[PDB]
Coordinates of C-alpha atoms in Angstrom, one line a residue:
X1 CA -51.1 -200.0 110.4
X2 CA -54.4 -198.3 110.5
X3 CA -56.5 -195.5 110.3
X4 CA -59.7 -194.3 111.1
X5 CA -61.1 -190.1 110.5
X6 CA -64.0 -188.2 110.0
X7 CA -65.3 -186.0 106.8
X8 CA -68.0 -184.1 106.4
X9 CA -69.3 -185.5 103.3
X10 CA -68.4 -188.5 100.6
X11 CA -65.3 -187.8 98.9
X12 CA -67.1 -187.6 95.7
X13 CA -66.4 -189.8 92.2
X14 CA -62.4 -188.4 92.3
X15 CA -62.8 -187.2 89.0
X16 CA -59.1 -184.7 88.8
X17 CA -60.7 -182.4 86.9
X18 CA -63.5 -181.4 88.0
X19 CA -65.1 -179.4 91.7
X20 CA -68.1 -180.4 93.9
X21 CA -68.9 -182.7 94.9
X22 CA -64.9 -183.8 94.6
X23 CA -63.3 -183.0 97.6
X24 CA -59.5 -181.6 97.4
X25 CA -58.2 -183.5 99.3
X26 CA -59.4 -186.5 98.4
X27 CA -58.1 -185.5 94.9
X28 CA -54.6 -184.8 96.1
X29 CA -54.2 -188.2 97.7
X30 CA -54.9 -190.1 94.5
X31 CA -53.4 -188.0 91.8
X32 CA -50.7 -185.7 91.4
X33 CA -48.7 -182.6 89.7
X34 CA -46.4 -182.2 88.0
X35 CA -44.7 -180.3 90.1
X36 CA -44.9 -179.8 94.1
X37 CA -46.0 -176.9 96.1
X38 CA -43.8 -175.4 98.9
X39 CA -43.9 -173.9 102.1
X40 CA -41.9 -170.9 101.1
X41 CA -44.3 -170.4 97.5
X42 CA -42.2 -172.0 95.3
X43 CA -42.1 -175.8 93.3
X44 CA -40.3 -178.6 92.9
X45 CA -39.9 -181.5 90.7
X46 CA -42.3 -184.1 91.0
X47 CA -44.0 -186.0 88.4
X48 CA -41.6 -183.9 85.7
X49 CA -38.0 -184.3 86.8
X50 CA -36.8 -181.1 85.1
X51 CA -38.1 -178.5 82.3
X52 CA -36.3 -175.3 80.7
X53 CA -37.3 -171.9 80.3
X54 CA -38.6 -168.7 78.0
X55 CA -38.6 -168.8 74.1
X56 CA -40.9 -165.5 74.7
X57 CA -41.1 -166.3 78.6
X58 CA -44.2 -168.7 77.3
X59 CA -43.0 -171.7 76.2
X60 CA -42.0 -174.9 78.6
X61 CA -40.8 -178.0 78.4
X62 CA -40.8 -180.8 81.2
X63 CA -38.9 -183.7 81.2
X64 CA -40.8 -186.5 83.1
X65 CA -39.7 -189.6 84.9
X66 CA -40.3 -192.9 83.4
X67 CA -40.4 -195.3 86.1
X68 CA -44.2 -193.7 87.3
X69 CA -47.1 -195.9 86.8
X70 CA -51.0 -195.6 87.3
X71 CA -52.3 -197.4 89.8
X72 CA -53.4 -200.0 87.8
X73 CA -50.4 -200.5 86.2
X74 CA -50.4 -199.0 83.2
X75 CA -47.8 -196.7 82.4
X76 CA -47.6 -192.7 83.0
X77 CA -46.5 -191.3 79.3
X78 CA -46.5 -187.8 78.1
X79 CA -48.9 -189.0 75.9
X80 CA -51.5 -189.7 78.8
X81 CA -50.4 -186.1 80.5
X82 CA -51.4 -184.7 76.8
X83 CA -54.2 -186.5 77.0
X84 CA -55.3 -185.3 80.8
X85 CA -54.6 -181.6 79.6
X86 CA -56.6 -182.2 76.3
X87 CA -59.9 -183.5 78.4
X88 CA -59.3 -181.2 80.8
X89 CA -59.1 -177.7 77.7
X90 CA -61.9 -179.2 76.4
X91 CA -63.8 -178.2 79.2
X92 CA -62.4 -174.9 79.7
X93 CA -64.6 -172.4 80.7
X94 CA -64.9 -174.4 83.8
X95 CA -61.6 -173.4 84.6
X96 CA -62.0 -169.6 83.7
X97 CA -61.7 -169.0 87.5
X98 CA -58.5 -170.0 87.4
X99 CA -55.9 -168.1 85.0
X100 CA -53.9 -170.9 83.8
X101 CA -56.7 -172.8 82.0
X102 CA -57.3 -169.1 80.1
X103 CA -53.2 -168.6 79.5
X104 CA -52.7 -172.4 78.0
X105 CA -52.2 -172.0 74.5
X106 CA -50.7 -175.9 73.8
X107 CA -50.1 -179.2 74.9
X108 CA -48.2 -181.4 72.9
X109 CA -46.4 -184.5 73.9
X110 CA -43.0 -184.0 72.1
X111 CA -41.7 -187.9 73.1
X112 CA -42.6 -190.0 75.9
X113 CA -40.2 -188.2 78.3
X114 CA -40.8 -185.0 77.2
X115 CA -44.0 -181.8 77.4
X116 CA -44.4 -179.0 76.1
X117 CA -46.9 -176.4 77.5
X118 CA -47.3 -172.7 75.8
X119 CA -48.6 -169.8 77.4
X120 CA -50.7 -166.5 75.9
X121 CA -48.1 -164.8 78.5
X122 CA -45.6 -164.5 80.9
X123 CA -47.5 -165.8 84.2
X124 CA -44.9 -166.0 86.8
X125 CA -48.0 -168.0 89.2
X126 CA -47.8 -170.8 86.6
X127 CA -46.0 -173.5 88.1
X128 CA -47.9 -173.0 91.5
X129 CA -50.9 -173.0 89.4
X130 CA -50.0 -176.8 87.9
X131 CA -49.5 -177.5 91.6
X132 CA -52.6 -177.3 92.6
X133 CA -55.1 -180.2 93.7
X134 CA -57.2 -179.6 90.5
X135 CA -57.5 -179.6 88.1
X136 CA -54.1 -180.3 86.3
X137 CA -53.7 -184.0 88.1
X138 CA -53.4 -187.0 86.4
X139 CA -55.6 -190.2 85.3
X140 CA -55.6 -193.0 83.5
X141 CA -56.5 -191.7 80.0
X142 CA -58.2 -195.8 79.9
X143 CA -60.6 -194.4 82.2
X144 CA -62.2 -191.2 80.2
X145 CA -65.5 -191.7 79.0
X146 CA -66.1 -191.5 75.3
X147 CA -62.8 -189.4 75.3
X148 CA -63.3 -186.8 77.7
X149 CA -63.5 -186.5 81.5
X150 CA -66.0 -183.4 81.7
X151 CA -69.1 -185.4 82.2
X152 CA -67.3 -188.4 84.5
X153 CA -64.7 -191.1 84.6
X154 CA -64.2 -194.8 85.1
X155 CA -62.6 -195.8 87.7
X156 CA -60.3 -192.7 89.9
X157 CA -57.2 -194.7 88.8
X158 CA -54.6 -192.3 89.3
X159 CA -50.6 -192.0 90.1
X160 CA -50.4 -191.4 94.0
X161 CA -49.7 -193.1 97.2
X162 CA -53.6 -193.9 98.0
X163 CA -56.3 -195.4 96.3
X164 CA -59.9 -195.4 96.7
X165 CA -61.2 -198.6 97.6
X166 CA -64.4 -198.6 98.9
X167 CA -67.1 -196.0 98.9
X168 CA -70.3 -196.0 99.8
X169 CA -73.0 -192.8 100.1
X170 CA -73.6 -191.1 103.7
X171 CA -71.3 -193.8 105.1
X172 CA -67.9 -193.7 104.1
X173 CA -65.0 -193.6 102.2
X174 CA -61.5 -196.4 102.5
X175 CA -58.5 -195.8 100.8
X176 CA -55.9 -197.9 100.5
X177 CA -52.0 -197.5 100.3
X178 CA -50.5 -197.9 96.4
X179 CA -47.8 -200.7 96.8
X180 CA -46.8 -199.9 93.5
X181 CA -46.0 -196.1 94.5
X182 CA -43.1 -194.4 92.3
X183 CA -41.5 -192.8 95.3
X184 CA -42.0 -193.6 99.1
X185 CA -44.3 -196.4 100.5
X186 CA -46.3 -194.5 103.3
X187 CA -46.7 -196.1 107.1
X188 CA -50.1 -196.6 106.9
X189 CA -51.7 -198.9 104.8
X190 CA -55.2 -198.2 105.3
X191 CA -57.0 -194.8 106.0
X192 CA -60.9 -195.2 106.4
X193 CA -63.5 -192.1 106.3
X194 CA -66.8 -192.2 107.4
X195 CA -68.8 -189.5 106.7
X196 CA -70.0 -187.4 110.2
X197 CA -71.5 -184.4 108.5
X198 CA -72.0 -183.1 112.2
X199 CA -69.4 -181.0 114.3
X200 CA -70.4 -182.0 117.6
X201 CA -70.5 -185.7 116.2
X202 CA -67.0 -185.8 115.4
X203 CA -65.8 -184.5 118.3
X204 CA -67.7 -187.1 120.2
X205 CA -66.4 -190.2 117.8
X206 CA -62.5 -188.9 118.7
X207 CA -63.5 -189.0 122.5
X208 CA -64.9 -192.5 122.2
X209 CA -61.9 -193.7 119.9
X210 CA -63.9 -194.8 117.4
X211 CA -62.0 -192.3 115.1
X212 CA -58.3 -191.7 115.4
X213 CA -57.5 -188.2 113.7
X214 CA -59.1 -185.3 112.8
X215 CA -57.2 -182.7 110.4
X216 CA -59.2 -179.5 109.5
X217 CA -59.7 -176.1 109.8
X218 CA -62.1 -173.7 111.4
X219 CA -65.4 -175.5 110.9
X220 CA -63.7 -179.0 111.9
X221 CA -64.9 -179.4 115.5
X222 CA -66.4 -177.1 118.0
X223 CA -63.7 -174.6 118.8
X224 CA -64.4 -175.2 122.4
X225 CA -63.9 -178.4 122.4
X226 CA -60.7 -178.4 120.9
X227 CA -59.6 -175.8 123.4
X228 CA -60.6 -178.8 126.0
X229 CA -58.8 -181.3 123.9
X230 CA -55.8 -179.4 123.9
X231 CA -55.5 -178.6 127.6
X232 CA -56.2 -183.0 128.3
X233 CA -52.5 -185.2 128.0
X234 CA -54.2 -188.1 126.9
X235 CA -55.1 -186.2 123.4
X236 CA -52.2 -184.9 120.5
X237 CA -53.2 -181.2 119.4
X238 CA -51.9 -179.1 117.0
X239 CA -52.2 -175.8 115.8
X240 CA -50.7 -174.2 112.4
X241 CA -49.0 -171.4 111.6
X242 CA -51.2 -168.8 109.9
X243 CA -53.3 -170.9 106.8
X244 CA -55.6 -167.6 105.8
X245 CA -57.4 -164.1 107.1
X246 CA -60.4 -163.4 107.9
X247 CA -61.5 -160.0 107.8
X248 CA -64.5 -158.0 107.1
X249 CA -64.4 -156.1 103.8
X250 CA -65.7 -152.3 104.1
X251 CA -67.8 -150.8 101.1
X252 CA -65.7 -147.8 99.8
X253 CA -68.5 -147.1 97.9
X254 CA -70.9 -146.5 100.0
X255 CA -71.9 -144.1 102.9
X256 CA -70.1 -143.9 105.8
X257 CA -68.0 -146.7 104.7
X258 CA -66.0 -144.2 101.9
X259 CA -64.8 -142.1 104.6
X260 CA -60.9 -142.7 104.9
X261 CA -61.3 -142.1 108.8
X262 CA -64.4 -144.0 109.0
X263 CA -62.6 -146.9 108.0
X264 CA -59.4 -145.9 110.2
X265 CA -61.8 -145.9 113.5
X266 CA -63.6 -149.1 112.6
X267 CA -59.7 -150.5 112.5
X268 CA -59.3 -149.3 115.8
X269 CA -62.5 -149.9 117.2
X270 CA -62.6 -154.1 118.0
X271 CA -60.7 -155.7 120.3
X272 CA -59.2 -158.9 118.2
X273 CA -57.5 -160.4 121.2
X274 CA -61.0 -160.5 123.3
X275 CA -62.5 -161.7 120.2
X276 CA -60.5 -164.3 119.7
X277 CA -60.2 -165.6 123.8
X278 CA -64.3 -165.0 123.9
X279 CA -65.6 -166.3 120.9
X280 CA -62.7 -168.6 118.7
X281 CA -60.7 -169.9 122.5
X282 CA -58.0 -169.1 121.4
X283 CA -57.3 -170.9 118.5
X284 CA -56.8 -167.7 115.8
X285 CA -54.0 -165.2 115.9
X286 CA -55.0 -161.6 116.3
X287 CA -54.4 -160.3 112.3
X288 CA -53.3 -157.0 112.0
X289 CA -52.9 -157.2 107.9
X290 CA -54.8 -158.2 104.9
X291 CA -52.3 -160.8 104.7
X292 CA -50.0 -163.0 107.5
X293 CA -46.2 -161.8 106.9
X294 CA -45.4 -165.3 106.4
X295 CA -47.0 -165.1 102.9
X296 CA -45.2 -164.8 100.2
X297 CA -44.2 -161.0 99.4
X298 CA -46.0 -159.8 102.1
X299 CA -43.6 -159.3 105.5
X300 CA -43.6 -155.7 104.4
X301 CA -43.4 -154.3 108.2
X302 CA -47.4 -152.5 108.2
X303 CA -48.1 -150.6 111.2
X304 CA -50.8 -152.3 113.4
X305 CA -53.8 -150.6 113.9
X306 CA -54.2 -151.4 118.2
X307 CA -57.5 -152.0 119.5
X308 CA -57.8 -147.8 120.6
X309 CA -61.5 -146.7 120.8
X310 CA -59.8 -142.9 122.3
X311 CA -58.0 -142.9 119.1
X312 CA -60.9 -143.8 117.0
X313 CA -63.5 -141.8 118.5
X314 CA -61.1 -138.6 117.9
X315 CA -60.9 -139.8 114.2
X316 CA -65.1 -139.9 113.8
X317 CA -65.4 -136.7 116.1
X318 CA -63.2 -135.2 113.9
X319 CA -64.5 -136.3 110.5
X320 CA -67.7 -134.9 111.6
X321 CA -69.4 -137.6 113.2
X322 CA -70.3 -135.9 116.1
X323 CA -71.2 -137.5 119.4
X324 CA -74.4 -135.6 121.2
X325 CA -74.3 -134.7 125.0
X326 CA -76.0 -137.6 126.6
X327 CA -76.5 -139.7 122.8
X328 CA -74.4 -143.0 122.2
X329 CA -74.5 -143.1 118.6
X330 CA -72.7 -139.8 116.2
X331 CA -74.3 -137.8 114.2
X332 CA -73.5 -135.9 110.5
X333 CA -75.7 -133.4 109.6
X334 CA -79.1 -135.8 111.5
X335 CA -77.7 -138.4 110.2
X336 CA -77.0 -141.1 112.6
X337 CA -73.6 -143.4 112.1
X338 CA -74.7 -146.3 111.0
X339 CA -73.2 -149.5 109.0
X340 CA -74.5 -152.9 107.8
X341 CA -72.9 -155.9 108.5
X342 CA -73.9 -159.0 106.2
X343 CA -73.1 -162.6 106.8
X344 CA -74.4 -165.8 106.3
X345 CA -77.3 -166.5 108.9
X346 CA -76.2 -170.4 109.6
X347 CA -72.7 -169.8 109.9
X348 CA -72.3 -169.5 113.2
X349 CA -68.8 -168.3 113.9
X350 CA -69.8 -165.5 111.6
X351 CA -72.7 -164.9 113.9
X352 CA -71.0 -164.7 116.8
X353 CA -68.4 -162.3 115.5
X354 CA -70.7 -159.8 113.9
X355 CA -72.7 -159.4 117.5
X356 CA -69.0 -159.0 119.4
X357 CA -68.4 -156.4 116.5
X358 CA -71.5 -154.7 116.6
X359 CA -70.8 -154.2 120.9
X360 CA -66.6 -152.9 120.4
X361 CA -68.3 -150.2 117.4
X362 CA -71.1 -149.3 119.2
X363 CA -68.2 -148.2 122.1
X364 CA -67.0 -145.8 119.2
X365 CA -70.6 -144.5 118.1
X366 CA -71.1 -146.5 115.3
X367 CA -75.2 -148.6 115.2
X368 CA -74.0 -152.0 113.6
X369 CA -76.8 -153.5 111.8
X370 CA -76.7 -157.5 111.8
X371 CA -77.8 -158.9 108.7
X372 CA -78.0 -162.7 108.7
X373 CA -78.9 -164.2 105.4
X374 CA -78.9 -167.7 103.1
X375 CA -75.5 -168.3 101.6
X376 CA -77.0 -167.3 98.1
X377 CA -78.1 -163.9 98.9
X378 CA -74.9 -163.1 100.6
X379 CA -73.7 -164.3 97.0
X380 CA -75.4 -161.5 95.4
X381 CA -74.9 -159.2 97.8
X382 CA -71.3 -159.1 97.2
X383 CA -71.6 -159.3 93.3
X384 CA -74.2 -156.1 93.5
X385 CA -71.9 -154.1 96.1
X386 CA -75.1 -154.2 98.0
X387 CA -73.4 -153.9 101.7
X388 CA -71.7 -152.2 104.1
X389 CA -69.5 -154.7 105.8
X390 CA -69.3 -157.8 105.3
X391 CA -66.9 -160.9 106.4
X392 CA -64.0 -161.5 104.0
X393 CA -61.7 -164.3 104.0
X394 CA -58.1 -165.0 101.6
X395 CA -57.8 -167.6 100.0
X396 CA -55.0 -169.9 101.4
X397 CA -51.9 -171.3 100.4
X398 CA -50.8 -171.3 97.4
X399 CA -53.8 -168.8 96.4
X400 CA -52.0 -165.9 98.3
X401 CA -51.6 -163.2 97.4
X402 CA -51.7 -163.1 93.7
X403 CA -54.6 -165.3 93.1
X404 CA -56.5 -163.1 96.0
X405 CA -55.2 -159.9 94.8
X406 CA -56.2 -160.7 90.6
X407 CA -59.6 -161.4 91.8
X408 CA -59.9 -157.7 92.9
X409 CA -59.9 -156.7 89.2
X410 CA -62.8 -158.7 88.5
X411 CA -66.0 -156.5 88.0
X412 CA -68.6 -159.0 89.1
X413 CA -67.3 -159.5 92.7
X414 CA -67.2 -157.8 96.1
X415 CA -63.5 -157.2 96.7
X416 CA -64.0 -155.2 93.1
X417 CA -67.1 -153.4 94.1
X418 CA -66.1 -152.7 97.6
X419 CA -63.3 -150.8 96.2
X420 CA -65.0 -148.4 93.6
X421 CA -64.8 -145.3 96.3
X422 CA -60.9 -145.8 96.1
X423 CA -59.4 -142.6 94.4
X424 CA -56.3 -145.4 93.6
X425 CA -58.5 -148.2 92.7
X426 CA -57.2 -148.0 88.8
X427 CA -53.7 -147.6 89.7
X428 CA -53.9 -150.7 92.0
X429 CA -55.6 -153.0 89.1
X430 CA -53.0 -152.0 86.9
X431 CA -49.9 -153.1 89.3
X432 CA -52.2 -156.3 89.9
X433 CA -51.7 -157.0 86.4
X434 CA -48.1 -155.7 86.3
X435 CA -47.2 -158.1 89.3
X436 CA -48.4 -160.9 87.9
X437 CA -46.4 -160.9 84.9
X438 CA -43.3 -159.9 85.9
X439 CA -40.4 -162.0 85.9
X440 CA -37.7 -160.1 88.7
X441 CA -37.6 -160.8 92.0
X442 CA -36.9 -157.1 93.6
X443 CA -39.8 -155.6 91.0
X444 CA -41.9 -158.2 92.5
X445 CA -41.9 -157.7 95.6
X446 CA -41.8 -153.9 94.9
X447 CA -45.1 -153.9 93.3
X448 CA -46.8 -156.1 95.8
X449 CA -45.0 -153.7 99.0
X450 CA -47.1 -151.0 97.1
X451 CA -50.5 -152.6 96.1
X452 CA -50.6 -154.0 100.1
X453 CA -49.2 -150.7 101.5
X454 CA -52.4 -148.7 99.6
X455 CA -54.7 -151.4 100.7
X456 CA -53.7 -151.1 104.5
X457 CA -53.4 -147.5 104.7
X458 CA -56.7 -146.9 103.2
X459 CA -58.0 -149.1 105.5
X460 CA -59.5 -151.5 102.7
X461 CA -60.1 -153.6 105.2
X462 CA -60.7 -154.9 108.9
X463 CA -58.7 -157.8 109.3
X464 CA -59.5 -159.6 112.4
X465 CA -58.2 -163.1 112.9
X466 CA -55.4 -165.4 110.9
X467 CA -57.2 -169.0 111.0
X468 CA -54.6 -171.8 111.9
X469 CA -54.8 -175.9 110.7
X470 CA -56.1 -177.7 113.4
X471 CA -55.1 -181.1 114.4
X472 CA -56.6 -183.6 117.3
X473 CA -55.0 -186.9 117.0
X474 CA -54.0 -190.4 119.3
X475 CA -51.0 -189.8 120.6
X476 CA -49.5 -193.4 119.4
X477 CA -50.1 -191.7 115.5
X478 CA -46.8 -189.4 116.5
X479 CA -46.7 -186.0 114.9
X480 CA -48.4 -184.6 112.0
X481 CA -46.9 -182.1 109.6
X482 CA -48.9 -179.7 107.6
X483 CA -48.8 -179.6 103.9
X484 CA -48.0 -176.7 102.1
X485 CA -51.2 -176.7 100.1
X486 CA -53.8 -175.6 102.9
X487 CA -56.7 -178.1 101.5
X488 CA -54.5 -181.3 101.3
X489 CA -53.5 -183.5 104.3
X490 CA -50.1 -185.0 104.7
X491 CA -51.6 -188.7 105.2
X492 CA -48.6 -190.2 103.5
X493 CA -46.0 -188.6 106.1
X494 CA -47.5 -190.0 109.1
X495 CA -45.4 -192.6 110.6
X496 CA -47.0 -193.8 113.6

């Protein structure tokens, strides 16, 4: 059994460790971890069978099966995961976003059943980190070129359940099912992609049939028509639990923004529910918090903010934003309240948001400016602090929190900038750090309770909407489970 979906774009060369044009999930179906993400946020064994623990807290050692092959045949060794770790340090600044390329100190291969990886410090994230789709994966160390992988491999020979057959450019992608697996054999033996880089176009090829699946998240088909598809029986539809925020971030640097109560009225001011019914059909949760309580370290029990434009005008009227006899917009001192909003100009989701936004604050007082610009100067924007609002989004499972929340410290960025009018902001990069490396459970989740409890009662943020995996599949293809890695797809669990 067969099956036929819809991407975007190509899947890219599958080179494991590197980014565009690769596509994650692509990646994830071909090579593997050594160690498997998990709904809850922690691992289990996967490629390593079992490792031990702390010399200093930094040093580990994984023992790894020895029945796993490539896909090729040849054999998975600790020598070719020393290898994959060496090609993939000697590119290492590439990796800089991500903290575990910076903490790795050593690989060594200690026997052919046994690795040993040192860190510069205790980085309790580290085994999610090696769980990710890239770029810790594993290839055939006969398919680097001249020794390395950074400029491009050979063939995408890897250890997983699917292998990439046949590609070819603007057309599609096939993969096939490894009958040589190490663990199970999956259902489907085939899974073909053509490439549909249009919305509407995707939507049209699952009508027709002439595509079977379609497994994505907000931008994966026009959110009305999946509301369609979800209300006809002939269709499967599924929607996730909450995968990530969006919000907008709110400059605390910046006029009126860096007003406590400005911030605390703009949280009251929208109506999420409407929002979401008018503009998203229902297929986003209302968020009240930076982050979903079913994230890790976060079910911390934060006050929701209702939609309450009584309660926020009282909080601007009050704050000395006055509202004139027979004016709509507040005043301070002749200054009229006003506030930028930023997004990108093509994105239309964002779009449509930012003018339902601009209508619920104007109800308060507030004149919402509508900036739509190209991606790239949205891009500087952020890294200048040169905005007022702007849409904001998390970063997914297993990013969140504490890839989201180390990202704050970061000087060149817009969560960092936003946050320079915060009389706390120092206190909270400190306890980013502090969280980060800590090995207790109870000081863990004391130190994130407090770095999330500032950032929601300064009212850092506006959250608005939690987006949710969607799913529109043939019925015959049974149920589809979500994988706990928001950017892969649990191909290899469908059983039709």
């Amino acid at each position: 059994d067969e099956i036929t979906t819809a991407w975007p774009v190509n899947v890219g060369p599958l080179n494991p460790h590197l980014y565009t044009p690769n596509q994650m999930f692509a990646q994830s179906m071909v090579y593997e971890p050594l160690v498997k993400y998990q709904a809850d946020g922690s691992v289990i064994p996967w490629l390593a069978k079992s490792w031990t623990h702390s010399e200093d807290g930094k040093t580990w050692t994984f023992t790894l099966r020895d029945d796993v092959k490539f896909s090729n045949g040849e054999p998975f060794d600790a020598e070719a995961a020393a290898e994959n770790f060496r090609a993939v340090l000697d590119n290492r600044q590439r990796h800089a976003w991500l903290e575990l390329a910076n903490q790795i100190v050593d690989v060594k291969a200690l026997s052919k059943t046994e690795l040993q990886i040192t860190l510069k410090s205790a980085y309790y994230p580290f085994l999610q980190e090696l769980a990710l789709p890239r770029p810790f994966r594993f290839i055939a160390p006969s398919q680097f070129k001249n020794h390395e992988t950074m400029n491009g491999i050979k063939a995408p020979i890897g250890t997983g359940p699917w292998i990439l057959q046949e590609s070819k450019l603007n057309q599609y992608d096939v993969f096939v099912r490894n009958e040589n697996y190490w663990g199970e054999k999956p259902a489907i033996k085939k899974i073909t992609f053509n490439v549909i880089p249009d919305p509407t176009t995707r939507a049209v090829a699952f009508e027709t049939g002439d595509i079977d699946l379609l497994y994505g998240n907000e931008g994966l088909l026009p959110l009305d028509t999946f509301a369609r598809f979800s209300q006809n029986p002939a269709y499967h539809t599924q929607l996730s639990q909450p995968i990530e925020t969006v919000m907008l971030a709110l400059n605390t640097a910046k006029a009126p923004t860096n007003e406590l109560a400005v911030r605390e009225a703009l949280n009251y001011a929208v109506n999420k529910k409407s929002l979401i019914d008018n503009a998203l059909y229902g297929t986003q949760q209302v968020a009240d918090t930076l982050f979903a309580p079913s994230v890790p370290y976060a079910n911390l029990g934060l006050k929701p903010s209702q939609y309450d434009p009584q309660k926020a005008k009282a909080l601007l009227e009050k704050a000395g934003w006055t509202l004139p006899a027979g004016k709509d917009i507040r005043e301070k001192n002749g200054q009229p309240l006003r506030i930028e909003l930023s997004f990108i100009g093509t994105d239309a989701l964002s779009k449509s948001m930012a003018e339902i936004i601009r209508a619920d604050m104007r109800q308060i007082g507030a004149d919402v400016s509508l900036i739509g610009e190209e991606e790239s100067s949205i891009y500087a924007r952020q890294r200048d602090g040169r905005f007022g609002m702007i849409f904001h989004r998390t970063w997914g499972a297993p990013y969140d929190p504490h890839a989201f929340l180390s990202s704050m410290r970061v000087p060149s960025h817009a969560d960092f900038q936003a946050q320079q009018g915060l009389a706390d902001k120092p206190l909270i990069d400190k306890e980013i750090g502090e969280v980060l490396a800590t090995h207790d459970e109870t000081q863990r989740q004391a130190l994130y309770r407090d770095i999330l409890t500032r950032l929601h009662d300064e009212a850092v943020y506006l959250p608005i909407s939690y987006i949710s995996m969607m799913v529109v599949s043939k019925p015959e293809l049974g149920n589809i489970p979500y994988a706990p890695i928001a950017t892969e797809i649990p191909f290899e669990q469908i059983k039709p």
